[PDB]
């Protein structure tokens, strides 16, 4: 199977969350509303495996 | 008046919080525990217009 091109990153300004300011933050105040928010914002502070992009490239 | 004798403000030190990732974050999930944490961490994310709710509560 295959969800997407599944390979190196190819974006830039849109969905972080590499600048772990929320998780490094909320990793101490227990508050998924802040991370649920962060990933609501668009960082996704949580993991770097299951990602979903809206601008596919297979066709572009 | 102010919170105290607020003076000397032309450096930066390890205390941010200009990178408003917590406040820009927590400004939407209502969670002073994250900012109380952020300023506990050392950013101090907190606008200074006319707030006077005796911050720095006794969390220890």
Curated annotation (Swiss-Prot), chains A, B:
Assembly and oligomerization: Homodimer. Interacts with host GBF1. Interacts (via GOLD domain) with host ACBD3 (via GOLD domain); this interaction allows the formation of a viral protein 3A/ACBD3 heterotetramer with a 2:2 stoichiometry, which will stimulate the recruitment of host PI4KB in order to synthesize PI4P at the viral RNA replication sites.
Range of the intact protein held here: 1457 to 1515 of 2209
Protein name: Protein 3A
Protein's membrane topology: Peripheral membrane protein
Subcellular location: Host cytoplasmic vesicle membrane
Species this protein is from: Poliovirus type 1 (strain Mahoney)
Job of this protein: Localizes the viral replication complex to the surface of membranous vesicles. It inhibits host cell endoplasmic reticulum-to-Golgi apparatus transport and causes the disassembly of the Golgi complex, possibly through GBF1 interaction. This would result in depletion of MHC, trail receptors and IFN receptors at the host cell surface. Plays an essential role in viral RNA replication by recruiting ACBD3 and PI4KB at the viral replication sites, thereby allowing the formation of the rearranged membranous structures where viral replication takes place.
